[PDB]
RNA sequence: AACGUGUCGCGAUGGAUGACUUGGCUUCCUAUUUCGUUGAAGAACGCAGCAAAGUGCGAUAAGUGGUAUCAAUUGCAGAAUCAUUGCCCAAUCUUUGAAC
RNA sequence: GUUCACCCACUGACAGGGAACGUGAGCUGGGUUUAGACCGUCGUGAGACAGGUUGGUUUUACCCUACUUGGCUGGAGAUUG
RNA sequence: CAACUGCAGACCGUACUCAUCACCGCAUCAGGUCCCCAAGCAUCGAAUGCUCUGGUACAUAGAGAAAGGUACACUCAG
RNA sequence: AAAUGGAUGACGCUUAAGCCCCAUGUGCGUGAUUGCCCAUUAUUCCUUUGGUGAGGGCGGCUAUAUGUGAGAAAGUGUAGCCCUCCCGAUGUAGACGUGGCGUGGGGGUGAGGACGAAGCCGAUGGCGCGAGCCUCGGAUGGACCCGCCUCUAGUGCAGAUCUUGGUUGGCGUAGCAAAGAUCUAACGGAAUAUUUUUAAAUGCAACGUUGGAUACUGGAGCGGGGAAGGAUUUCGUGCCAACGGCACUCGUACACGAGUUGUUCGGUCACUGAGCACAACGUUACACCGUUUUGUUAGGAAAG
RNA sequence: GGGGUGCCCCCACCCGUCUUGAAACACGGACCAAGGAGUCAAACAGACGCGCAAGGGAGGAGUAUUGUGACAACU
RNA sequence: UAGGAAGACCGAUAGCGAACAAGUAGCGUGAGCGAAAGUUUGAAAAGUACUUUGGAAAGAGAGUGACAUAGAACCUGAAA
């Protein structure tokens, strides 16, 4: 873990390596819940699946569409990444289970230190005109987080 | 490639003669690195009974008597493993050079 | 405001550098020194209790026999001078190939 | 194929020029200017001719700027005193 | 010599495919690749259209009237 | 009189800030001989470096313990033996010099290391004109290595449309648009009906089988059998890491086991064809050459 | 005193190359690590170092030797 | 074919193409062409029993070891 918790006896940690989701999509999905409460972060992910709210795309927004639901975050671009939300819901469930083992109350935890990194790539190939072959690569990611009880 | 060299015969004999004279001056002997503080009468000449020794213990007593053991001890303490790739090429240890003993033949 | 920029601590990605070396390259010397119709060199197919490749071997098939030494082989079994190990006299030596 | 020119009509009038002889990732491909082929003249010949004739692939923008619309949001020491 | 009877009939191939996924094109590539069997109605018919048997729903999908496109898609007064 | 809007450099200037001439501090027909601003120039001061450089000292007796003090080398070149003085200093191609810097190895000499070697990192400073050297810290590493004199060489990189690896904006972008197409209920599956901070506005989307519906191929067929080519892709059970450019609970994927039965079917046994070329003969320095079906090998004694 | 970051006034065309002339609407130039180019031999000449000198020097061979021995010494 | 002796040589993009199941995998109708790759964890596998969440992969604890930021293509671990 890049960072250290202030109080180690009231913190629950969780991480996953080589997750098979797009790194750029998971970067935005995980970043929005930093500083949130555990219950508030789970609620937002459920509403994104229902397509009532959206995930704001702040760094890898490229040329993506505009939407009205991005005004809540103070911008105009956003999306609803299905695969990344489901994977992040599983990670939060594991971190909640770790807190129960230690005896903490999951209803009071606050998320700190979300971090997403690039993982080793996986290689495929595609066929182009005039007998050419070009790379068709996959970009997984690592994710790590912890949460503390105030 | 030209690996070997030729040297004039007279020049080779000149070099040997000069080196022999340099070994007769205690100032030049100390400056090269030899410990000769306990020696007497450089150049050192000893009797011919040395050739009849049969045991290494007898030889070591003779070296201590004439004071040449300090130079032998200097070589012993300087033994160490050579630095660099040379230790992979059949030259693993390095040591210094001690006294000479000149004999009338190989007996 | 966000995006973007810069410095520092920590973490990824990647496999450089150092230290290692049962490999290569170069030079020199010594022999009771030089294959085959008494079927060579090469090529194919097989053989282990569990055995794909490689190694050894040929239906006596990871070996039979002689000799010196003696307690091992080992991943798991399994057997308990006779094995293993080194060397070598006696043998076996599938289908081909100069192939007749 | 033309630029040019020349005729037929209308009109108030049917002026002259420049912009990489404006403008081919805007088009078209008639001309010019490969390889096929015919004629005339020239050359012993292979071949030649700014002489005539017929047939002959027109590739790529998702980047920066310019332009056209379309939105979000700071800023008076033009972010600070 | 014609009948009957008794015994014996050696070797190799044999699965699957033959193509809008099993072969050749760097690939499960709208390209290429020999032979046999071939129903009903309309109709001159192995043209073209539809159907019983056999075989298939496999080729990224959802929402959905901007401009500009491609089309084995059309219509327009004088 | 010309082709984008636009140039005494711009603004502007007319008792000029225009044109031709004349002057100068405090005080312009009473101070005669500098109104003021800007250089890699000139004068002057300090420091460096090189000289066709110029001088001087270098025979150490003045006296001195601690609780006015250090040096002095007869020298090209160094941390220059020391002290005065004078004159030059830029430079492409090019030449030369340097007790000039750095790298791998040999001969010598002197050290260092598990109380931590090499390597690696740096808002670690110090020294040098510079190439560089050295200390410091590592919440780095875990076994070798360096100073000096000499010898030796596969000895110093920013570019060669340089070589080999790795990384990269473009970029979650261009796209994944021929062959018309699927819908419904139940079951299966971890893939749901997942909320503690009434029911909809907080677990979406997607997969296989069976029944039902709808539809396509339309006998020159996404039908049923073979050759060439392929060679276990065939079958059952299990399995979902990677692969089938979306998906998979499906699979020609992965794993473990199974399957091909002939007196008559195809081939050989057992025919000739377009043709081939062993023997024999001839040629060639050399068979690895030529002849060898128009009834037919061979100067040719080929019948067992 | 040194080091880091920001700001102010002033100064300041993109590197390598061919060319009389490059900031060029002249060519090569996305980034990093490790590689990457005057060497060896033989004949001659000049400068400088060393030995001997009207003389200088061999080579090939030979003589004596697990010893720093493919060296060194001697003819 | 059997032995020996060495080196002012190279040191994993070097040295033979090959320090490794190398004339191998792979390519071509064929003659032919032809790699990459140090298993260098640790002195010793002592190679993480067991609890808990998860379908699994894995995560959170516990444990071995001087060191696990030595956890299995596992010494060191640079730059972009
Ligand atoms: Mg393609
Ligand atoms: Mg192709
Ligand atoms: Mg244009
Ligand atoms: Mg004529
Ligand atoms: Mg068929
Ligand atoms: Mg096809
Ligand atoms: Mg009729
Ligand atoms: Mg019909
Ligand atoms: Mg038809
Ligand atoms: Mg009309
Ligand atoms: Mg100069
Ligand atoms: Mg070297
Ligand atoms: Mg480099
Ligand atoms: Mg798109
Ligand atoms: Mg139909
Ligand atoms: Mg058919
Ligand atoms: Mg897929
Ligand atoms: Mg020119
Ligand atoms: Mg230039
Ligand atoms: Mg220009
Ligand atoms: Mg190699
Ligand atoms: Mg190689
Ligand atoms: Na070293
Ligand atoms: Na002016
Ligand atoms: Na014939
Ligand atoms: Na050029």
Coordinates of C-alpha atoms (C1' of nucleotides) and ligand atoms in Angstrom, one line a residue, chain H residues 13-15 17-19, ligand 21:
Chain H
rU13 C1' 22.7 -7.8 -27.3
rA14 C1' 29.7 -10.4 -25.6
rG15 C1' 32.1 -15.3 -26.7
rG17 C1' 24.1 -19.9 -34.5
rA18 C1' 23.8 -22.7 -29.8
rA19 C1' 26.5 -21.5 -21.2
Ligands
LIG21 MG1 24.2 -15.7 -27.6

